[PDB]
Amino acid sequence: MEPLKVEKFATANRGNGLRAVTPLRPGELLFRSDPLAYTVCKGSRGVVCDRCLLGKEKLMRCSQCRVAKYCSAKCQKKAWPDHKRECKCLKSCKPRYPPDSVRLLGRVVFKLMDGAPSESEKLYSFYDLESNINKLTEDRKEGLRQLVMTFQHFMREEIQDASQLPPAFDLFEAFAKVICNSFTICNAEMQEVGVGLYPSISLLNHSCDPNCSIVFNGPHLLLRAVRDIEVGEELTICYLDMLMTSEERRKQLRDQYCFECDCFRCQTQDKDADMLTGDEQVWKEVQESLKKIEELKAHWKWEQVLAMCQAIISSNSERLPDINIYQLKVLDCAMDACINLGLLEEALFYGTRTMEPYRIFFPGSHPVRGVQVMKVGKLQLHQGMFPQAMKNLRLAFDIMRVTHGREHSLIEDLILLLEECDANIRAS
């Protein structure tokens, strides 16, 4: 039904890339892709369905390994192909659990042996993926070697030798490819729930100011334009969190992707000054604490996250502004924690404080901001603060119709809320 509006091409210096073959407007869906392979990530193991990656109140463990959990038999049956070979591996590893990259690659090798050409590889295959093999530092090669051994041990029940996989496949190279090509999979409210490989989507080079963005529906990846784009214009996404200083961005791009970004934001340290508002002596502590805090959120430990956040927020109220990114991230965690713990009034407290900083650091239309605004607007609505909510709901609608698309369930809710809210306002 739908014309393909993107194509692979060779760039001057970034290797291959993806570009528009037709003019594109904001919100326009460019690509829908299934994973070559994917898995729930460590922190969400028993929290979301192994298959559809949805959070369901109550999940059924696979009777054999008791590691994989599903929201229904339909999901358990749909997953058995992808699960067959790991089930034994997982059961035996117990009480151990392998790194995600190991479990992920474990699913990949079997997909590689399909005869049904992968829909996820229509533009680019696993074997085309960049490994950056010649640019890896010795520290990295070492860690990769370890992953290789861990794989050999983890898969030993199913694979004993190289001849049981395709001749072109190489473990060391596979892991290198995995580090720089895997996508973290997020639910609709941009919470991290998994990781996957989407080889065709892997063509997109990075920019700290991208013209496209990505949102998932379960393991399905949707790529959209968030900006007007011209024929022949390279399509880009941002590989990184938006709340990072030019220097943090440089380091992670170096360490994980073996390149330095020359985008205009990196040239000019764009917003670095705002991000670091406050005294380094103070906000350094906050940056440190964030390590533990975010590891806790990855494991959905909301009580624990709230406590750490409260101590930090309380203690800094007199000397550190909310626009400082480390402090901002602590507020964002605090809010999410309160929302999950039914502390709604208090969520509104922390949430309102992220609003202006988010508008600044998440320019334009970004799914992360769209969802933030949506949450605050809903919290407002809940507290009866109608004209405030209405303003925010309207704004979330405007952002998310572009980042999530009109057919999205979250847009459905928004419209209903805008209506209930607009009613109470013109009844006031």
């Binding site: 990259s101 895997s182 997020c186 996957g196 590989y239 990184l240 969190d241 938006m242 799914p367 992360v368």
Partner: peptide, 7 residues
Amino acid sequence: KLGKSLG
């Protein structure tokens, strides 16, 4: 963190 971020 394994895998590209989304924001």
